[PDB]
């Protein structure tokens, strides 16, 4: 399959409570492999997956230096953006950054991304061509002009097409025993009467990786949305995911309903029907 590497940075100002809280996490697909937390005792980039632990001391030294430098840029940027939006020195604000690259099954570059937020809203984004920016507002237009003048796109493009894909390929090789797994969902259905005339059918998917999955209820082969509940896909905390979909049905009509399960790890999609 295709693979992705993504980094997620959060910087939160806490005026009068010291420098901003900076948290960085790194993912390959849905697997976290590193973290940095400005508040933690180590002051180091730290491993969060077994297959990254084999990286030598030079890896940890350089990752720590680079992520600390980015936490300092974000600290300065919180001050600049507070200025741009004419905000009080007293309020807490948040910068978020997501960047990364996708590779195909051949390990070759497909796409790169870099997107920044302020207070939970789009601020500035690197365009698909990795040569130009989209600003969300007039403050971000100021950033866009500074970034055009500094040729910031060129540095992002060189990383995203170079070190990003090169190191993603290396991680996919070092972690191949775990990162190339497709754990199919283990499924079951439950039945609970709600009244003398209605029952809940709940279709379960457990123990699957990656997270992407579709659960659909049909009645007589037609997609149902009314009287359904679909929960958000959730982590089990063991490297797998869980999801369920429920439908409320008339009592004695359970057999008209089918739950369809689609996942990368299934040779063919599964269909479950309430089996008395």
């Amino acid at each position: 399959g295709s693979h992705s590497m993504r980094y997620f940075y959060t910087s939160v100002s806490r005026p009068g409570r010291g420098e901003p809280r900076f948290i960085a996490v790194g993912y390959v697909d849905d697997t976290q492999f590193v973290r940095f937390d400005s508040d933690a005792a180590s002051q180091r980039m730290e491993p969060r997956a077994p297959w990254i632990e084999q990286e030598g001391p030079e890896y940890w030294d350089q990752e720590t230096r680079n992520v600390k430098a980015q936490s300092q840029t974000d600290r300065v940027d919180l001050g600049t953006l507070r200025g741009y939006y004419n905000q009080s020195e007293d309020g807490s604000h948040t910068i978020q950054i997501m960047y990364g690259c996708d590779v195909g099954p051949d390990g070759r570059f497909l796409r790169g991304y870099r997107q920044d937020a302020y207070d939970g809203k789009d601020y500035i984004a690197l365009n698909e061509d990795l040569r130009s920016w989209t600003a969300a507002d007039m403050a971000a237009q100021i950033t866009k002009r500074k970034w055009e003048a500094a040729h910031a796109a060129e540095q992002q493009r060189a990383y995203l097409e170079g070190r990003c894909v090169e190191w993603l390929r290396r991680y996919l090789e070092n972690g191949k025993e775990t990162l190339q797994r497709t754990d199919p969902p283990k499924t079951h259905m439950t039945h609970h009467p709600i009244s003398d005339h209605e029952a809940t059918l709940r279709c379960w998917a457990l123990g699957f990786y990656p997270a992407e999955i579709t659960l659909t209820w049909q009645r007589d082969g037609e997609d149902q949305t009314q009287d359904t509940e679909l929960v958000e896909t959730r982590p089990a905390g063991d490297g797998t995911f869980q999801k369920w979909a429920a439908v409320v049905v008339p009592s004695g009509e359970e057999q008209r309903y089918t739950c369809h399960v689609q996942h990368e790890g299934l040779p063919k999609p599964l269909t479950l029907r309430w089996e008395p």
Partner: peptide, 8 residues
């Protein structure tokens, strides 16, 4: 790895 930054 992380990226090798221009102030906003």
């Amino acid at each position: 790895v992380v990226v090798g930054g221009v102030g906003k």
